[PDB]
From a paper:
To date, family GH139 is the only family known to be able to degrade α1,2-linked MeFuc, making it essential for RG-II metabolism and a feature of RG-II-degrading bacteria. In this report, we present the 3D structure of BT0984GH139, alongside its homolog SDT91673.1GH139 from Verrucomicrobium sp. GAS474, an organism isolated from forest soil. GH139 enzymes operate via an inverting mechanism in which we propose that N412 functions as the catalytic base and E561 acts as the catalytic acid (BT0984GH139 numbering).
To test whether an ortholog of BT0984GH139 from a soil environment was also an exo-acting 2-O-methyl-α-L-fucosidase, we cloned and recombinantly expressed, in Escherichia coli, SDT91673.1GH139 from Verrucomicrobium sp. However, SDT91673.1GH139 showed no detectable activity on any of the substrates tested. A glycerol molecule from the cryoprotectant occupies the suspected −1 subsite in SDT91673.1GH139, stacking against Trp686 and positioned above N412 and Q411. The openness of the SDT91673.1GH139 pocket is facilitated by residues T462, T551, A487, and D473, which replace Q461, E561, W403, and E472 in BT0984GH139. Specifically, W162 and W490 are spatially replaced by R189 and R186, respectively, introducing a more positively charged character. Interestingly, SDT91673.1GH139 belongs to the ∼1% of GH139 sequences that lack a catalytic acid residue, suggesting it may not serve an enzymatic role in Verrucomicrobium sp. GAS474 from which it was isolated, but instead may act as a glycan-binding protein for a substrate distinct from chain B of RG-II.
Residue numbers in the entry: 26 to 831
């Protein structure tokens, strides 16, 4: 216990004086989250996040900010300690640092939509106290892109990316409402009510007006907010609580609620009932159940790495091992904090609900410039891009974090009916296609679709034909089902989605003369595009996905998949073109011995490799799509045939970025390349100081730690996410990091479990990870030797293959 705690020994740090909100700690219960900090004056401040606080603009909003100010500063000169305790699910502040009980104890109940702030003066001497609601959305705020200055409004272009093509080039951020507080009461309350919605105009632009009566508006009249109260407080204003009598021990309770409401009073009635109900619960019983929830969560799985004690080693290896261990845990803490949405909202890759900021003063605000510092901002806006989001969820399987995965699958399942009707209308065949990115309700945004597009093919070439996510989602769900053996999940979530995706892939294209499907028009992820409709033929990601997924669907238990489904899937499988293969040639910048960047530059003497497609043009991004057959689809890798094909492909890759969504490290682990994998894990989760980087001086991809935040695991986006400083935490970075470390330890080969496929011997490790058939593997490697291995259930031990650390 304490193994993952984060301890700070001072209120002061690099940005405390001018930007204390950059020194927050995150904490959540899966739906409600806080970013909490202590300012140099001793105030406790926190921003409030919620997974489903979607505004009229589709913007994910903070619920607000709260400031607690004791009448007498509670800090002392002697010492100070602020600690994140993940196994108790809490943040605690001690002053002095050795005080027996914390000055501030902050937690979000694992089991209820309430957060608690408990205060205890160290002297036991009573104090007055005031809590202020700090809302910044008090009047409508204009964000405008002006004709001569398109690049100036980063808030417009990046924070409202999905709306960038709105006619008129104006986004208005509607304000919030503070409810009148009851005179003499101990409660204040506030919320945001969506009085309008972008959804009807979007359906009309996308030729889907006919679906408007069938699927209700997902934004209109959505109302979300919170109630703040505390025993012994009185509302001295609608935005202010104060202690009536000085106290040495007191508490604030924050209850959060989202619903659909005709007005804020209706919302407030339901939220007051929620507060009444939950305030009646015994807080110590709630605290015990909260702590037990977190103890069990951390007992599901772990990876604890350290340097071994063999003479001749390098102490930096131990330093890196420990840093990697802490980072892996902090990623898990943030995903759990945001990963049990009450409304099937996937974890936002661009900051989850743990973004921070501080609004610029109204008097300084310029609508033509916007405000990227404001608390609601996130680079990339609110749409959910699969290429980033998949990396958050893949590692949850080996962690055993099935509950964190269900909202992602549920999101797609709830969108399936609309997207099936859309496909029926657009394409006049069965099935459903899921765009690479779009709004949470499943449709692409109008910028990617095209304002006034007379057709139904997406205008944006980056994602015009990219629908591979549906296949990859199906593969992830198949792993979930194999692990949990949850038949209800199989029948009610996996199968309808798999049915739609597989039917689309069977019906949207035509068989050619050889009887095999010709995948054109098509593209290979976002890197090889098809402006002509003919530039890309037979992309490897999609073909590899069908090769990996269709046999598994065909083999599902009797009475789940239908015999008719099996017949259709078998025919699709039998009609697949081959996985794209070829030889090395000249790649990007005419470099030799590479994956040929124009498909036509293969050299007859080149090494045999996988290709990103059978036919493809020049690159428009920096993905290595040919590697999809290694990860996620496990067609090649250590312990599988044609390992040299996989290795040649990896060595010949054109793109070698690290951190963010870059997934080279995962592929290296899948190929048994322990050194490559270790290096990438160290870049994502630590700092790579090793001299020969294959990268320029001061390459940003040598470390993913935050540039400016005190909680350094608020990852920064990787260089391949583009030029700017993005939004932190970039959870795709930490998701990739988890996949790398897990894949170094454990990989599945159908029913078999391969341990230590790419593990460096200099690292001792104690781990517990999950696998298919409700199996856990708990192992301890010391000085390169497996000292202990416990497999549950025991009969599954016979399916474990133990490889040697390298």
């Amino acid at each position: 216990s304490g193994a993952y705690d984060v301890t700070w020994d001072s209120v002061a740090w690099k940005n405390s004086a001018a930007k204390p909100w950059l020194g927050s700690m995150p904490l959540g219960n899966g739906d409600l989250g806080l970013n909490v900090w202590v300012e140099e004056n001793g105030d406790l401040v926190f921003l409030i996040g919620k997974t489903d606080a979607w505004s009229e603009n589709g913007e994910l909003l903070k619920l607000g900010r709260v400031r607690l100010h004791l009448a007498a500063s509670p800090l002392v000169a002697k010492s100070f300690r602020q600690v994140l305790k993940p196994e108790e699910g809490a943040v605690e502040v001690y002053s002095p640092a050795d005080a027996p009980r914390p000055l501030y104890r902050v937690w979000v109940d694992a089991n209820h939509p309430v957060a608690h702030v408990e205060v205890r003066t160290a002297s036991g001497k009573a104090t007055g106290a005031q809590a202020d609601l700090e809302l910044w959305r008090n009047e409508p705020r204009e964000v405008r892109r002006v004709k001569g200055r398109e690049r100036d409004n980063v808030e417009f272009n990046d924070g409202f990316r999905e709306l960038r093509d709105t006619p008129g080039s104006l986004v208005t951020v509607d304000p919030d409402t503070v409810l009148p507080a009851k005179p003499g009461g101990d409660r204040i309350a506030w919320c945001h009510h969506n009085g309008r919605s972008l959804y009807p105009a979007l359906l009309a632009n996308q030729h889907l007006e006919s679906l408007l009566p069938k699927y209700p508006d997902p934004l209109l009249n959505r109302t979300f907010g919170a109630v703040l109260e505390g025993p012994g407080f009185v509302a001295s204003g609608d935005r202010t609580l104060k202690l009536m009598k000085e106290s040495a021990a007191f508490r604030l309770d924050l209850y959060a609620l989202a619903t659909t409401a005709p007005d804020v009073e209706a919302w407030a009635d339901d939220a007051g009932v929620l507060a009444d109900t939950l305030s009646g619960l015994d807080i110590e019983a709630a605290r015990l159940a909260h702590r037990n929830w977190w103890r069990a969560f951390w007992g599901r799985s772990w990876i604890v790495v350290d340097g071994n004690d063999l003479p001749g080693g390098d102490p930096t290896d131990g330093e890196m091992a420990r840093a990697v261990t802490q980072s892996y845990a902090m990623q898990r803490w943030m995903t759990a904090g945001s990963g049990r949405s009450v409304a099937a909202m996937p974890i936002p890759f661009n900051g989850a609900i743990f973004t921070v900021g501080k609004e610029t003063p109204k008097e300084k605000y310029d609508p033509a410039k916007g405000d990227t510092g404001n608390p609601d901002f996130r680079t990339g806006g609110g749409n959910i891009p699969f290429q980033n989001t998949r990396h958050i969820y893949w590692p949850m399987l080996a962690s055993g974090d099935y509950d964190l995965m269900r909202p992602f699958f549920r999101r797609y399942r709830e969108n399936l009916a609309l997207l099936t009707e859309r496909t029926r209308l657009y394409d006049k065949h069965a099935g459903a296609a899921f765009p690479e990115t779009g709004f949470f309700w499943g449709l692409p945004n109008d910028a990617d679709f095209g304002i006034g597009n007379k057709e139904a093919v997406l205008q944006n070439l980056a994602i015009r034909y990219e629908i591979q996510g549906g296949l990859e989602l199906t593969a992830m769900m198949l792993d979930y089902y194999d692990a949990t053996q949850d038949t209800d999940f199989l029948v009610n979530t996996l199968l309808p989605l798999a049915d739609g995706v597989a039917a689309y892939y069977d019906q949207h294209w035509q068989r050619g003369g050889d009887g095999k499907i010709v995948f054109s028009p098509a593209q290979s992820l976002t890197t090889y595009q098809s402006p002509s409709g003919k530039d890309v033929v037979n992309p490897l990601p999609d073909i590899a996905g069908l090769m990996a997924v269709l046999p598994r669907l065909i083999a599902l238990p009797p009475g789940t998949a239908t015999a008719a489904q099996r017949t259709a899937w078998k025919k699709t499988l039998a009609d697949l073109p081959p996985l794209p293969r070829g030889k090395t040639g000249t790649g990007r910048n005419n470099t030799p011995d590479k994956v040929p960047i124009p498909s036509t530059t293969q050299k007859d003497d080149g090494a045999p490799i996988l290709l990103p497609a059978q036919v493809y043009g020049t690159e428009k991004n920096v993905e290595n799509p040919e590697e999809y057959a290694i990860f996620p689809y496990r067609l090649f890798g250590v312990g599988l045939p044609e390992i040299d094909l996989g290795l040649n492909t990896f060595r010949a890759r054109n793109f070698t970025d690290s951190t963010g969504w870059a997934w080279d490290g995962i592929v290296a682990a899948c190929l048994g390349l322990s050194d490559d994998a270790k290096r990438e894990a160290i870049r994502n989760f630590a700092e790579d100081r090793n001299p020969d980087t294959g990268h320029g001086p001061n390459y940003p991809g040598l470390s993913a730690f935050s540039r400016e935040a005190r909680f350094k695991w608020f990852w920064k986006p990787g260089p391949s996410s583009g030029p700017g400083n993005g939004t932190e935490p970039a959870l795709d970075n930490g998701g990739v990091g988890q996949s790398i470390l897990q894949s170094m330890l454990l990989q599945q080969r159908g029913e078999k479990i391969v341990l230590f496929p790419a593990w460096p011997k200099e690292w001792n490790v104690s781990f517990k990870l999950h696998a298919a058939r409700n199996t856990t593997v708990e192992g301890v490697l010391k000085n390169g030797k497996l000292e202990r291995l416990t497999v549950t259930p025991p009969e599954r031990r016979g399916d474990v293959i133990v490889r040697e650390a390298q």
